[model samples]
Target: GEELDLRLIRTKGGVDAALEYAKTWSRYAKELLAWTEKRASYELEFAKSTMKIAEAGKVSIQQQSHMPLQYIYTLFLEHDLSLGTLAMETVAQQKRDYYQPLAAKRTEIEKWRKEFKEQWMKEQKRMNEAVQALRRAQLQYVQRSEDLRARSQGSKQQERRRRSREEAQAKAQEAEALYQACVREANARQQDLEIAKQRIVSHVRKLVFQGDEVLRRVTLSLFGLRGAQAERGPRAFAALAECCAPFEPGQRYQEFVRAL
Candidate 1:
């Protein structure tokens, strides 16, 4: 199983299919990079919003609460804020690192896909010429045979006609063979190209899944932890969660994680 070569059956639609597939992944890399930047800024915003809430909560209780209790709560909230901030920053940093290679990998595969298209087009062009040659040979053979049949009965003419007919038959057979060979080679080349494209697609999908798993864990870990400002509404944390939401098949990133 490991040694067997995988292949696709046809080149007629496959070049376009591969190109479309490559572009889809390329678009994903670009969008992932965009999200990576967006989340970084969003995390910093969450950190600041959280710090404000922590300060406010400390002030609220200091007016009517024990200095000792207030101090303890204040200190705890501050620590929580710091930890949450660090976690957000870590997620952003890891995303930046992870996305770099995925973008590179997508680009690498695109170049190969381009070359594959070019070679495939060349093969198709050669095969087209081979088919035309075959057609012409068949027509010429038919005309020669008809001419031989139309000629008057004669020893000299008969021998000449026989030779002409034989030559036509040979040429037609040779042309058919050439056309068949061209088709075979082109189809074989297409299979190789399909395999190459499939490998690239499979690898890119694997890397994206890995990136998704990492970010999902980071986001979930932070989600479970309490932030400094627990009372000023969960809006900030919600935003962070939304950002960390596993990329779905778009905004509904839950299914993406589920499937993964």
Candidate 2:
């Protein structure tokens, strides 16, 4: 049969585990921030590129084309593209604004974890030293008492040994008191550490929720923009079609070819 002391001995495991978990959250937050930044930049770049292309198309069509129908269709397309690009830029800016808080919270949590870990390690060392001192005092007291017991009474040496044992006992009692104080302190600290862990956990949880919420809002905004863009496409195409109603496909092709 295996025997064990079921009593809880303070270990750094809980604190370290909590810290590791918090680090994971920090890592996730860092990655999320980086991804959000990269995505926003990409989105903005795409929007700018689209705007540039649309503007160039408009300018080229205006300058090079003499066909009225072709010019009208190009102008309509440019307007539609510009509107879509503006929407994309707006969504990108919104995403940047929304994700900023997650990044800030990540920094705050990381700083707190660092300071907490440092202080906890220091307190753990102090507690360990106190335990060692208590054990040493106990050993000396045990040995001194044995020595006094082994010696015969009524002799000078025996009297001196008795006094020595009494002194050792007093020291042991003092050490015991100190150890108890340390235990109480350690227990309180442990609770504090646990509370800190919970606080971190709570913050991380909220951050995750916030991240999801931001994504949802961004996604919905994108969807709204996409829907608007999609709706604009057919209307723009219909306008182009209306303008080209008089020209047959072959005639339109010939005009486009001649203009180029």
Candidate 3:
């Protein structure tokens, strides 16, 4: 009861508290987003710093140090780490990372947009027809009522009046039915439009996840880790695996890496 009191409209801690709470939330959200956006170059420079520091450690192994650091060449590759790859390979990777999934999502969104819009248009036409029917029914009922009022007193006049009243009532019922049907159909179409929009969003999000995973596996394979794993046994492979863990190369993908 106390908690409900705080939330209810008839209470002191309701509207004002809600407004203040949302205001603070907005302020912090902006600040946090701003702070998040500010970060990037530092981590980038730190990566380069680590690469520079490692040169000292490999002083005795000049051949290993100078050996080409060309492994993976794809999206999210450490471009600043003095790493590079073949031209065709990098271009192919870019297509794999950005082009294919994006194209698929773009095509999907367009197709659904067309489909949903077509359904909405059909619903709009139906609503228009329903409104016209309702208006016509109302006009007919009103005219019949006027006719009944104009009839003079007589057995014939009373009989005509009764028939007119029944007809008017039927018209009024038809108008009500038409109005309610239009409202129901309009609401259904609107809901379908909203649902289609959400479905499009879901498709895009799924594509993004799949594409990122592909990018990771694509780059990890570039390290030619599979070949190195064969040359070095399981223990050495496990040790080397730690070095590439940042790429999150899933199992069985090492074959994909070896192919690279």
| Highest lDDT against the true fold, candidate | 2
Per-residue alpha-carbon lDDT of candidate 1 for residues 1-260, written as tens digits (9 for 90 to 100) = 11211232234454456456666766766786578668767777777788788778767766752233344455566665765667575666555555555556656766765765676676666666666665666666566555555553448977887887777666666666665666666566656656654554444445445545654555454444324234434554465456544433333344445656
CA displacement after TM-score superposition, residue 45 of candidate 3 (Å): 31
Identify the leading candidate in terms of TM-score: 2
- Give the clash total for candidate 3: 1
lDDT of each: 0.58, 0.63, 0.46
* Root-mean-square deviation (CA) per prediction: 16.0, 7.2, 17.3
Backbone collision count in every prediction?
1, 0, 1
- Per-residue accuracy of model 2 over 1-260 as CA lDDT, tens digit each: 00111111133465466567667878876886677668768866777777777777777777754455666758775775766566676565555555555666667777877876776677667666666665666666666556555553448977788887777666656666666666666667656655554454444445445555655665576567556556755676677768766765567667678877
lDDT per residue for candidate 3 within 195-225, as digits (tens), equals: 5434433443443345446445544553453
TM-score of each: 0.47, 0.61, 0.34
How well does model 2 score by local distance difference test? 0.63
Stretches of candidate 1 exceeding 4 Å from the true structure: 6-45, 55-68, 152-260
Stretches of model 2 off by over 4 angstroms after superposition? 1-16, 80-88, 150-246, 249-260
